[model samples]
Target: IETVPVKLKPGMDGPKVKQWPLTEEKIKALVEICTEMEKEGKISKIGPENPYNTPVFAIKKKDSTKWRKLVDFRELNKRTQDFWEVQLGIPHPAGLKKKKSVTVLDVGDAYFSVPLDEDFRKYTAFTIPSINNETPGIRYQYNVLPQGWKGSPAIFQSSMTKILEPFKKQNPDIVIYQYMDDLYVGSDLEIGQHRTKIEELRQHLLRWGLTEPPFLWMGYELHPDKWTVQPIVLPEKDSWTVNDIQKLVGKLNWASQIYPGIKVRQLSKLLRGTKALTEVIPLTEEAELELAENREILKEPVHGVYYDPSKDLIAEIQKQGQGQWTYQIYQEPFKNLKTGKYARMRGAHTNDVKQLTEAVQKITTESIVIWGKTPKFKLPIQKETWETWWTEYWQATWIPEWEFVNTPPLVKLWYQ
Candidate 1:
């Protein structure tokens, strides 16, 4: 295994910081990926971070298994003070009134899921050695970079897309769009074409070391209009509750995908409650209601969730360190809803600039560098919203066009 050590800033006690070497592992991975652009030439830079702030890395192979991978234990280990709960995976329409029986398969929660083609393995760490700096927190460090990490998405998305590329070889009617670990297997036909395509996807996911979640909440598409989750109900077809805890218990909450800054990463499990039987059996309407109420007590699950970044109020937030929470949940009022998933562009360079325009430019630029590879995928016009409360606001210039298959479409929604 490749391992290295890294030092921590002075006064901050505890163990040294371990990090995955991005320059070689991630950059090389990016270059090696076979994508349209990659086939032509590698990405030159992802904003300033890749070229400037991004580190240059090297490694030495280790002989012993006991050799520790670097851990930024000091920063990583510090227990976060925020105690929040992601309500049980919301299994119903997250918005709008709908039949109570009709549950919406909400995106429970997500991580910058790496190797989603494989099991979600925690990242290893390496320490580094430093000079001139006294108390010596530095040591050598090495580990694989993940999506959302510097250049990780580019490497991950491109490579996974390549591995799945061969599928297009035989089928000739498949569309593969990868956003990090999120993969969508699309074809012109509405449904029932998985015969060849699904097997292809499964094999590709497995080969590339990506894993398909037990419940592909949005395996069909990003949403109902796009794609919907093919629910593998626990008990079987139609039974609301019959299977294992895996169906109900969320391994990784999807809310994190929207609010990445959330500090608390806790395990959610179902607890069976004991009910005393008096003279009645099968539990009465009151008892069933009671059981339902008891179940609801365990963090109510919200389904089909999406983060609305427009909620971020510029006037309310002044500093970058201040924007730990997503803008959408800011006014949510619930303690658990007061989540702060670290915004990528917002978190890393919060100190460097201010103003919404600056945030949009820097973040979009950084995303392009890492994902799009160029400012080519950009908004043609700046959207201006005068002072007003917004519930439904779509600019005349914001109309969407029919998606063209042969060539990419022109106008794109701000939403991912």
Candidate 2:
């Protein structure tokens, strides 16, 4: 049994119970047990002002004729929980629901396994009659956490929980359940692997709930609701009001509801002043561009990726081609091979993605390729897919130039 100090509420008096009649044999038997515990260093003599006392009695041990001393703690139990309590409320092991071998252990001498805090032990002292001819025995207090104290169960529960914490890890296949002093370990695997894993798990019994899946992807399939937003036009500057900001904020709420996880950094920034100051600031030139970009992107589909940085092997850049989307992992030291013009190199149109544990990104046909790089990783789009976005981009450039050029050597060339 492992032991740790028991903590109690501050500034409380101990109880004193009136003496009750007991047979000499019973008193002698109780004194023997108490004396033995004292010799073993489980309790010590103590004195403090107005120390609380409790009535003690003996009940026959189950299946035996011998009597065991039992302290009346009903009052202590009530007062302790008025300030401190332990609710074990642990869920039963899932593995135990099936037919499996479960190893169970009852922490021996459970309450005595937890020692009382040195200063608090004085309040637990009680006096009994001496076994030697009729004089009263000196008052004795438990050095270890004793049964029948107001906080004994809570103290024991907390200490045992700490001792067994390692087994509570999010291990998918095994289950460990603790209810009071009873602990059970169970698994459904074949006995060999089950035993091995249980041993592996026992080494970590005091550390639970530590593991999680690296990535959880959801909401990718087509749904009836389409994600789209109308262009936002700002009101006249002179009449700008907080209501304008509220309306935009309301629309943004609707956009994010249908497609969660979209980046709202710009919107988040704009709403701060309005939320706090409750007034409008006229939009800056950059703010107007931000408004336009937010509305434009809200019209596209959204995808979500939840990854654990510690568990994921690499970050990914998703690619779309022939109306299908696939993720391409960012592998290090990418190969660039060519024996001749006829030879081929292994790479696709690529983009770099920022540190991603979770990201919600836009997935659009127009955005056939989008990639970025940082010091740690790079994401590249598919080879042919890059051409799709580039072609549309390249086509839009010439028209803007053409529309401005009725004569090439005019204002356009004048600046040049």
Candidate 3:
């Protein structure tokens, strides 16, 4: 639980702002939370002598009546010094292929678990609203990491990574993935052994005072064999601000990781015209139609392929009638022992031949079978000609050993 103290730039002071008025109900909820936080020693009552004071607010929790207390640290965050960027080793959800069972762990109030430095604590001061004319408002500062600080996530993630290192070394066979407070452990061991490992992990985490036991990433359900989308519900609004559209695009972009071919053309088009975040714009008819089509496409599961390093990769390259070069990568379908049928997988594509060559080299170290065609030439001849042409155009060092076919094999196309 040991952590380096957060350092702020010298001579930098946060602006003291007037308290935001809250409804009677919201004030009651905020008081309830502040009382609980005070009891837990996460915050301490302080006098008005503190120079730094930020306003506090309450946001309602989703699908619940309870309100979550939050501090408006925007002004303070602007003045704080930057810290070292911590790179977390969060594994891709697709990497869970073939694992028997996955156990997910959650850490309760993760930020509050790490105590703040005494000297630095004063900088996090905030004012609570007065309940009535008789009762005066009080000032308090954080004893632990505050929720809205920009550095909280990186600091917490670093501490958790260090705390779990010893356990990771001891159980080298267990695959652990962490994203901030959420941890996922995947195992291929026997069911009994896996259960024991989960218990052992819980015990280790508890020793460090980390506890709470619990997703779909964005809206996609990552499964062992495929990635599927959950039910998506878009808010019924006549117009959306540029900021809202940007946020929606960001989510869709993350979800599109499963299917690279799925393009949000209309969304991108909307973004191209506006640079302002607050400007409200209505969705064009084409954009609405595209959104509907995308929703339908996401209803089907995008199948995943198990990559075997020993297998040969098939590269199909063609020159279009307009002289634009296109390429598609494919692998020989292997039998799936679980489902007694041949399992087919999809590949990546590019319009530029130079990018296509670079992608092929980067994708795998396995041998490649070249299936190529051009306007003037065919298969084996085109393979040699393309190699020489590529070397002359790009001045490349390596040339792939070529095995050409007159026509591509009967592999199912991912896109028509």
Candidate 4:
């Protein structure tokens, strides 16, 4: 793909790292991968005169059998200019209604397929440390788009989308969705007809040098009539780092889209007052229980719901603890379609009651249904109760104006 060369911000220079220490096994893997890459013309040896260089490392792939070579491009990425304006939009699988057939395509070594410009190749130089400490490390520069570079995906995605414009126009009947290197093509046609369409699309992609396979769209499994979360395998450990907690919370946040009542308070509680990503902390008993509960919730699949403007939109707010509250803004559909539950439009945890009140105001239609007691305080409250009084004032002002429903909604609470 021929595109404009990536430009770095003014006075930005590449990293000058000589070597990064790695485990013996990782060193062996790195050497093997770099050798193959050099042979394949993905990377080439650079002389000592080259001024730009970044550290390289190898991590195990999903199968834990193969190593994936990566460069530490964070320094370079920080200074790189983003000229591409292509909106990163992935079509939600839940948006698909009834489809008879679905096919997924994945392009192998997707980023490496995009050739790097000669001028930009210098900045992509990386160091491959030697097996023994006695010898100097070899320097190699990428001939193609390197992994961990921020601009690689944006460039690849935009180029591919441009190339597929003609194919999309030609086949208007078949639905083709592209998310970077992964493509999903679905149709309502019969099995034979769907197969033919997919084959045609595949041939079109081959002409443009794009190939594939696919996955759970945004962590949700898309069945013909229902969408369910693809459960994550919880790490078997007693303690987790800040990074681990963040990753787990991110995955669970996807489920919150459909399951509004899913509790993330415990997870958020662990995250509060944490700064270091590498700092290991023990999981509380409450956090452990919440983790286990989330695992069980993902087992059942629910039919995806579309928002109906005619339906009643309810904002259910709950005061879980002191200075902690959770809110769910959802739409109550007319009929109980199997699950007999409201569709969660938005939900999150907040420390301030004002933030929650603002959220309620933003989504409020003609009326809204709020649950739980609205905090109240007498006039001329004490200094110590000022914060609590302010919280109560925000709640009391809005609660009286809106419709009240004392009975709790049929929400599947994650905790008592």
Please, what is the whole-model Cα lDDT of each candidate in the order they appear? 0.28, 0.42, 0.54, 0.55
> Model 1: residues >4 Å from true position, as ranges?
1-142, 208-220, 223-416
The Cα error of candidate 3 at residue 145, in Å, is 2.4
Please give the lDDT score for candidate 1: 0.28
Model 4 over residues 10-129: C-alpha lDDT tens digits?
876766665556777767877888898899899999998888877666654222345656566656776677644556333344423345555545443566777987888888887767
Question: Model 1: per-residue lDDT, tens digit, 86-155?
Answer: 3232132222111111111111112223222111112122223233333332221112333223223333
Candidate with more favorable, higher lDDT: 1 or 3: 3
Instruction: Give the lDDT of residue 80 in candidate 4.
Output: 78
Ranking by lDDT: 4, 3, 2, 1
What RMSD does model 1 have?
22.8
Q: Which regions of candidate 4 deviate over 4 angstroms? A: 1-3, 16-20, 59-66, 85-105, 108-113, 157-159, 170-202, 207-416
Model 3: how far is 199 from its true place, Å?
7.0
| Residue range with the least summed lDDT across 10 consecutive positions in model 4 | 365-374
lDDT of 3 by residue, 1-416 (tens): 56566767788765566676656775777788888889999999998678777877665421334466757676667677676545433324444444566564544356787887777788888877775645777678989887767566557776777778898899776666543333557666776787778778767766776343111111111123332213333445777888877766765665576544455788778888737899997888887887777667666555675544445445444433232333334453222112111112113133244444443332211111111110111132346545444331221112233444566532211111
TM-score of each candidate structure, all chains considered together:
0.24, 0.35, 0.41, 0.43
State residue 260's C-alpha deviation in candidate 4, in Å. 16
250-303 in candidate 2: lDDT tens per residue?
A: 555555544444344554566565254456667656656666776566555444
What TM-score quantifies how close candidate 3 is to the native fold?
A: 0.41
